[PDB]
Amino acid sequence: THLRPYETLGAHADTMDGVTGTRFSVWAPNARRVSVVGQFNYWDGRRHPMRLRKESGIWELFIPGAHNGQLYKYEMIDANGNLRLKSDPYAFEAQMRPETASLICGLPEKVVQTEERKKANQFDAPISIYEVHLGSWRRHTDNNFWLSYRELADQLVPYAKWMGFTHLELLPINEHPFDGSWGYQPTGLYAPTRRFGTRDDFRYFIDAAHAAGLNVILDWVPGHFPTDDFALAEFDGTNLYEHSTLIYNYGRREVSNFLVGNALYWIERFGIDALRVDAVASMIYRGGRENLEAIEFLRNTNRILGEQVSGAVTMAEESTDFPGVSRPQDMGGLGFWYKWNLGWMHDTLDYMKLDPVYRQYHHDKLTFGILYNYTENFVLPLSHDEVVHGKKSILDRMPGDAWQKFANLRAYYGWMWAFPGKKLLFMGNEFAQGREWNHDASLDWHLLEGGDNWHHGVQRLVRDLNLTYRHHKAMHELDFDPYGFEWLVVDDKERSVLIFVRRDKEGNEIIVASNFTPVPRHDYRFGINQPGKWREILNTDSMHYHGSNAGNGGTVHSDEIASHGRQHSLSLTLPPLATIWLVREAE
Ligand SMILES: OC[C@H]1O[C@@H]2O[C@H]3[C@H](O)[C@@H](O)[C@@H](O[C@H]4[C@H](O)[C@@H](O)[C@@H](O[C@H]5[C@H](O)[C@@H](O)[C@@H](O[C@H]6[C@H](O)[C@@H](O)[C@@H](O[C@H]7[C@H](O)[C@@H](O)[C@@H](O[C@H]1[C@H](O)[C@H]2O)O[C@@H]7CO)O[C@@H]6CO)O[C@@H]5CO)O[C@@H]4CO)O[C@@H]3CO
Ligand SMILES: OC[C@H]1O[C@@H]2O[C@H]3[C@H](O)[C@@H](O)[C@@H](O[C@H]4[C@H](O)[C@@H](O)[C@@H](O[C@H]5[C@H](O)[C@@H](O)[C@@H](O[C@H]6[C@H](O)[C@@H](O)[C@@H](O[C@H]7[C@H](O)[C@@H](O)[C@@H](O[C@H]1[C@H](O)[C@H]2O)O[C@@H]7CO)O[C@@H]6CO)O[C@@H]5CO)O[C@@H]4CO)O[C@@H]3CO
């Protein structure tokens, strides 16, 4: 099939009877004369000129002498044309940023997705995502140097495992010239950025995450076009990948193939378990208002991906409300598995930002999320996009003095981990970093030095939340089935107390109660479905995270006393600015 253009183009290693070498392949429909430079070729085009094939379009030439390990570029005349030293677009590795040349390397081996890594990707799974910018997670203390891929294999991977995440999500690791793009303005789409080491160093890093029982989600940018370093624009002299606001042309089957391959490339040749596409709204908008060319391309890919690599999922962030982004292509379209719930993020943060005394008027911000919960398969994200550009850290959004801010933050996490939808937390959120995220420095790990403090408390809470959320199927099995969620107290606006139930397929119930004001609530009676002995399995006010240790303090048995149109009732202590999770003890 014509499906994986990385398996044939690029710069492979082939044999031509005994004599060994490097079977090159580029792509230009016009051009007129393209050849190969490098260290095996003295960087001069009149030593190895390359021969065209007219039907397909690929200029090529086996070369007996150039090995895996030597630098190279290309050299072409174009539609008329000029002289251009073009970079291989299928460069599986790229030189350091002196000249940004390519490098002769093969395909890395091949990874078979396990059945356990597929099982961690499915709708009924616990999914907690640690999202990380590899360039600013951590840095060496003495010189502020990046950690390598192998150092991240030793430090980021165990830290994520211990913290209880199921997934690691990397910002784009495309090669790219500018740090401050974070990876969203790429040059080498097929090359693991050399900032952190070789391509095999990065492959080693993925096996390590895999060894630790982590899936790796990769941020994938098929919707951002290379605008820097002349790399992919006016390439052959005409407009191949580029069109005629410097966007892509997903027209030709060989711009499609380039992209479809790149998705397949990471999943198959590194072991990547999920891809996340950002800004689908900018991809399919800006005939109709739409961009029907890009709608077809996503719809296509997510069906191709669903049958080739049947276990690896896709996720999307769409900033309008294009309907059914996470619904099958046959009707609605797009065909992703998951979608980021930005609406939820905006609504709940707005709620958290409110002075607690004003919360009674904005109850709607917490209860609205159920309405549209079953229109998409949702990821509750607390992303990098939320903590830069003057938007503040998540911690600094909270009202109150220091202790009140932290208690607020803990309750919000308590609530978030209970609420229907998968989970995503950006690095530094877990220890309540005070400052906005700075891509040019390490995170504020200095906060965690010295005596045990409030940041230790939040980090502990995130790990307990992760471990409690995994474990109990009620917390994660039925995110997308109305059966998995039922309000117990939706309408206590006055006191800002919200209670609801989570449910597994067996029908076990976990009660989540949030008190969003610093007024302690004693003897708060509410109705329940399953009478019996009840017990706290989670309490954001526990002194373990530096709360006041307010709580129910033991087993609590219910009463046959009606409440909220229900036959039996629990009467509980609700701690101030706090959520608690209750479980039913078996009889
Ligand atoms: O420079 C020689 C250096 O070469 C090799 O470094 C590699 C390394 O593998 C990677 O770190 C990477 O370097 C990156 C950095 O990671 C990136 O953050 C940035 O670094 C800047 C820093 O942000 C900034 O602090 C400062 O760095 C100063 C630093 O304060 C001093 O410690 C001093 O560094 C010297 C070291 O003491 C010494 O070990 C040696 O370093 C080698 C290293 O052995 C080797 O691994 O010499 C350096 C002097 O360079 O001075 C530096 C100033 O450079 O400034 C830098 C730059 O803005 O920069 C690079 C991004 O390319 O890649 C390098 C090389 O490929
Ligand atoms: O703009 C959206 C919505 O905003 C306001 O709704 C509040 C509501 O006031 C709160 O009490 C709470 O709603 C809770 C309920 O307490 C809880 O029972 C459950 O709701 C379910 C209902 O039991 C059930 O009726 C059904 O709702 C259907 C129903 O056929 C229609 O009502 C329809 O809703 C539309 C309304 O016609 C329209 O008024 C507006 O809704 C407003 C609402 O006016 C206002 O009070 O638009 C909606 C479009 O949906 O459709 C729904 C099904 O989609 O199913 C619900 C869901 O389980 O859960 C809710 C949600 O937590 O919170 C909401 C939101 O702030």
Curated annotation (Swiss-Prot):
GO terms for molecular function: 1,4-alpha-glucan branching enzyme activity; cation binding; hydrolase activity, hydrolyzing O-glycosyl compounds. One of its GO terms (biological process) is glycogen biosynthetic process. Its EC number is 2.4.1.18. Keywords: Carbohydrate metabolism, Glycogen biosynthesis, Glycogen metabolism, Glycosyltransferase, Transferase. The keyword Transferase applies. It catalyses: Transfers a segment of a (1->4)-alpha-D-glucan chain to a primary hydroxy group in a similar glucan chain. The active site is at D278 (nucleophile), E317 (proton donor). GO terms for cellular component: cytosol. Pathway: Glycan biosynthesis; glycogen biosynthesis. It is an enzyme of class 2 (transferase). The keyword Transferase applies. Belongs to the glycosyl hydrolase 13 family. GlgB subfamily. Monomer. Catalyzes the formation of the alpha-1,6-glucosidic linkages in glycogen by scission of a 1,4-alpha-linked oligosaccharide from growing alpha-1,4-glucan chains and the subsequent attachment of the oligosaccharide to the alpha-1,6 position. This is 1,4-alpha-glucan branching enzyme GlgB. It comes from Escherichia coli O139:H28 (strain E24377A / ETEC). The chain holds residues 117 to 728 of 728 of the full protein.
